[PDB]
Design a protein around this ligand. Structure first.
Ligand SMILES: Nc1ncnc2c1ncn2[C@@H]1O[C@H](COP(=O)(O)OP(=O)(O)O)[C@@H](O)[C@H]1O
Ligand SMILES: [Mg+2]
Length: 152
């Protein structure tokens, strides 16, 4: 795998632009917030981009027409945090780990791979954490990665 230094917010922009047309067609309200424009990490850019894509795809599918999506990025000094929130029904306790299992899906033509791929990339590849909470009238997926891979 290739690791590079890049601005994580520029990557989020790239993912927004990828989805921009779907978001418009579905009349989804998309919101973005950051506490540091210059959110630089050393990470596997293609794979982190894939995490963002998988989460944003799930958010669109969960929120549906006229829904709402918010992405927040936060500089936490030795690590960065990205949150992808959508308005929609909550995830029950009994599924909060199961949703990350390969092939688990509640969708008719679901792969059930989006989140298992996310977990592999964030946790195994980057040494980070990914989890979900129910917040407001919706669901947030949060990941954190170190700004630089942790020296052994
Ligand atoms: N934003 C979300 N809100 C509610 N449920 C979600 C969300 N994202 C994922 N899920 C649940 O996690 C399951 C697994 O997601 P994923 O691994 O991406 O597979 P797929 O999208 O193909 O079902 C989904 O089928 C859904 O039940
Ligand atoms: Mg998915």
């Amino acid at each position: 795998m290739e690791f590079t230094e890049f601005n994580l917010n520029e990557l989020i922009r790239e993912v927004y632009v990828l989805f921009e047309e779907k978001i418009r067609k579905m009349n989804i309200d998309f919101c973005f917030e950051t506490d540091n424009e210059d959110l630089r990490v050393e990470a596997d850019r293609t794979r982190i981009k894939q995490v963002l894509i998988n989460l944003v795809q799930n958010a669109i599918e969960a929120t549906g027409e006229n829904g709402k999506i918010k992405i927040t990025s936060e500089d936490m000094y030795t690590k960065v945090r990205v949150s992808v929130w959508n308005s929609g029904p909550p995830i029950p306790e009994e599924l909060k780990e199961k949703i990350f299992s390969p092939f688990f899906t509640t969708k008719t033509q679901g792969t059930g791979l989006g989140l298992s791929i996310c977990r592999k990339i964030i946790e195994d590849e980057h040494g980070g954490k990914i989890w979900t909470e129910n917040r407001e009238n919706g669901v947030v997926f949060i990941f954190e990665i170190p700004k630089t891979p942790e020296k052994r």
